[PDB]
Structure formats: structure tokens, C-alpha cells
Subunit: 158 residues, 3 copies
Amino acid sequence: KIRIGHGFDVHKFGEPRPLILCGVEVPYETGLVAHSDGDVVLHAISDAILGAMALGDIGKHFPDTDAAYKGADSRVLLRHCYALAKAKGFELGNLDVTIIAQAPKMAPHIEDMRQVLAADLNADVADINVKATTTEKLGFTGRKEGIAVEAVVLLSRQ
Amino acid sequence: KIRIGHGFDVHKFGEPRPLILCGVEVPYETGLVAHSDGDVVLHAISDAILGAMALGDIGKHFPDTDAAYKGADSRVLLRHCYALAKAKGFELGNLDVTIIAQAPKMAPHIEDMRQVLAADLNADVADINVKATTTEKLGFTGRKEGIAVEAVVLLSRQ
Amino acid sequence: KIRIGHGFDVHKFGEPRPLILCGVEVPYETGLVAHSDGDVVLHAISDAILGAMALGDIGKHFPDTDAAYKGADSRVLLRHCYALAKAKGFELGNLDVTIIAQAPKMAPHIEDMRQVLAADLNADVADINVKATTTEKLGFTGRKEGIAVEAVVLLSRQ
Ligand SMILES: CC(C)=CCC/C(C)=C/CC/C(C)=C/COP(=O)(O)OP(=O)(O)O
Ligand SMILES: [Co+2]
Ligand SMILES: [Co+2]
Ligand SMILES: [Co+2]
Ligand SMILES: [Zn+2]
Ligand SMILES: [Zn+2]
Ligand SMILES: [Zn+2]
């Protein structure tokens, strides 16, 4: 059995702290506003994994009303979601992620991001893709208000 | 054979009628503007199912220019789409849906929404996921101008 | 083995040149700004194919800093991407594309667009779907500032 999932997340720029994206610190003038560490990339991937498994979403599992998650490293959340999939007998088929951001430039960090995911998903990096595009100065990402991320995943029984 | 589909839909708030989302009435000051009942969630799912089967989209099947479909119940339209899939020998593998909205609050309604889909797709609820995220006040969804939905589906032969 | 991919692209209107979408000239008062011919539909599909194969994105393979791609017909880029998949032992399972645009009207062009893809992907048109939706005058698409495209693909080992 193969199961599909989709994730989507957005956070706004403006938090004076390191910009951590897909577990990688990317140099920038500001960071992302969030309850947790603000890793919008890992959140979208986590929601895709929960989604594929019909386990709801990260708002259910890791609520922003709970101080337990304040400033949390989002790799902990990602690993929890993947562990739920593994406990149900599934593993990664393949993952494809699209970072939608006007800045910063993602290209120098893509490989480091793929390696974070290979480690946390106990996967071959050949089964993991991270991409980036701008929206050519259009919309909220084009105005540098924040970053959006889309992810799709296939999980397979084993 | 397994086949993938993707749906995306948006409607604007402002129509003085019940807000029906994934077949569930959610309390809100206004409803969604559309030719049919405005159920942006079922529309996106419908387009994902039509899309997986290479049958076009809801604009083709249930045209905005067509009086038959003025105020149409979107559960009826979803079931039309799924019946076309079944006629081609396919059934639901699994479905994951992402509601993108600042308001209303979706969490209290998720399970009711899943149960609507399990009934309308004659499917096990374990194969159906409905998620929601805000965009942290960014973009037209973040400003409560309307609601966006993304959906992905896998259909399998039998 | 089956592999999933997702692509997303946006370009802004305002280049005085033919509007080429999914390889098809669509009448409109202006075209799209881009380094290549600006075919946002083929770019998104290309990124889905690269993504499924974990080969990065069109920014990596066809950089905008490189004059070799200036004005390039985006069918060349799509064919390169698909050829990489074929070289790795994969072929099209099925493809579903969503053009997100307030104008121009896509419906008259959908079948021509599908035929471009059936040719370039050496595929049966029954495995190829192209959809369109508006965002009901919301956001940058709704304001007719540009066009966005989402695509999902399933590739299967040959
Ligand atoms: C946010 C979202 C649903 C992203 C999914 C992919 C995407 C950007 C699709 C194109 C249509 C869209 C939702 C545009 C957003 O305009 P905007 O909200 O950026 O416009 P505005 O703030 O300039 O009105
Ligand atoms: Co979120
Ligand atoms: Co629509
Ligand atoms: Co792009
Ligand atoms: Zn988040
Ligand atoms: Zn609709
Ligand atoms: Zn492009």
C-alpha cells in the first residue's frame, strides 16, 4: 500500500532570531515568527506525513497554546510524526518540497537541508528533494512578508 | 494502477448564506460567493478526483454559465465526480486535504468533515485526512478575504 | 517503484510578447516576464519531474544568470527534464496540472495544451490532465498581476 500526503505552511518574517529552514541556519536579517523555532519547511513536511497517515495535523499534535513547544526544535516534531508513520508500518517512499520565498537565496543550503531530512527520516537522500522558487515579487512572499512551503510525500508499507 | 490528482480552489467571503465547508455548516458572519453552494473544500477534492482521472475540472463538468448548477450542493457534485472515477474502475486510495484560512476556526469541525467524506466516497475514514492551517495573517486568506483549499488524492484500480 | 513530484511556479505579466502557456499561444494583451519564454506551466511541470527524481529544480539546471537560456522555448527544458527521468529508468505514470489565473480564459486551450504534453512526454493523453481555476479576484492572481501553476506527477519505473 502506498499513501499520499500534502503539507502547506506559512510564517511571517520579523522575529529577531536565527532563520532555521529545514534544520539549517540560513543567514538573514531577521527570522520567522512562530511558537516553535519557526521552521516552516519542517512543519510543512510534518503535516504531509501526518496527512498521508490520516493523523490530522501539527496543530492537533503540537498546539501553540502549550508552552511545552515554545521555541522547540522542529526536528523533534518531524521525528515524532515520522515515528508515528513507522509505528503504523510505513516508511518513506519519496518526498518533494517547494520553498516559496523571495529571499534569502536557498541554493547554497539545499544539500545541507536534504541531509537533515535523510537523517531524520532514516532515508536515502535519493528519496528526498528540496526545491525553491520565488513568486517574482508578487503576493505576500514577493513582498518579503514571510515564507511559504509546499510538500508532498509518498509513504509505503514496510 | 495508481493515479494521483491535485485540486486547488478559492472563494471570497461575502454571500449572505450558510458557510458550508466539506459539507459541514461552520458558524460565521457570512458565507462564500460562488455559482454553486460555495463549498471550497469539496470543490478542491472534486478537482483532485477529476484530475487524477484526466477528466478535466469542475469548470467543465459543472459550468458557472449553467443554470442547472446554480446553488448546487457540492456533496452531490463530489459524488458525481467519484462516480465517474468508479465507472473507470478506480476507487479511493487515500485523500489528504489542506484548508488554508485565518477564520473561521476549523478544528472543532474536522471530524465531522472527515465523516462527510467517508459517507460520500463510501470509504473508510482511515483513508481520509482533513487539515487546516492559517497563513499567520498573510495574504488574502490571512486577511480573512476568503478561503483556499488544496487537496491531493491517490486513486487505485478496483 | 513509483515516485511523486510537486511543482510550483509564478511569473508576472508585463512583457510585450506572445503569452505561451503549456506550449500554446493564448491571446492576451501582454505576456509573462521571465528569462526563458516565460511558460509558467511547463516550468511547474518540469520542477515536478525533477522533484520526483530528486534532481533539484529548474533554477539549478537552467540558471537565469546564463544567457544560453534567454528566450528559450520551455519545451526544450521540459524535454531535458523528462529525458533525465527516462535515463534513470522512469516514465510518466500520470500528471495533473492546475493553472491558477483570473485571465485569460484557459478552457479553449486545454486540449491543445494536453497534446503538447502528450508529445513531449511521449505519453497517452489519458495520463495527462490540465485544469484551471481562478481565485475569485483575490490575491496577485485575482488582481491579474500574474499566473501561478501547481503540478503533481507520478513517475513509475519502466
Ligand atoms: C498562499 C497560498 C494559498 C499559496 C499556495 C500557492 C499559491 C501562491 C497559489 C496562487 C494563488 C494564490 C493563493 C495567490 C496568493 O496571493 P497573495 O495572498 O500572496 O496576495 P496578496 O497579499 O498580495 O493579496
Ligand atoms: Co501551519
Ligand atoms: Co475553482
Ligand atoms: Co520559478
Ligand atoms: Zn509552522
Ligand atoms: Zn469552487
Ligand atoms: Zn518559471
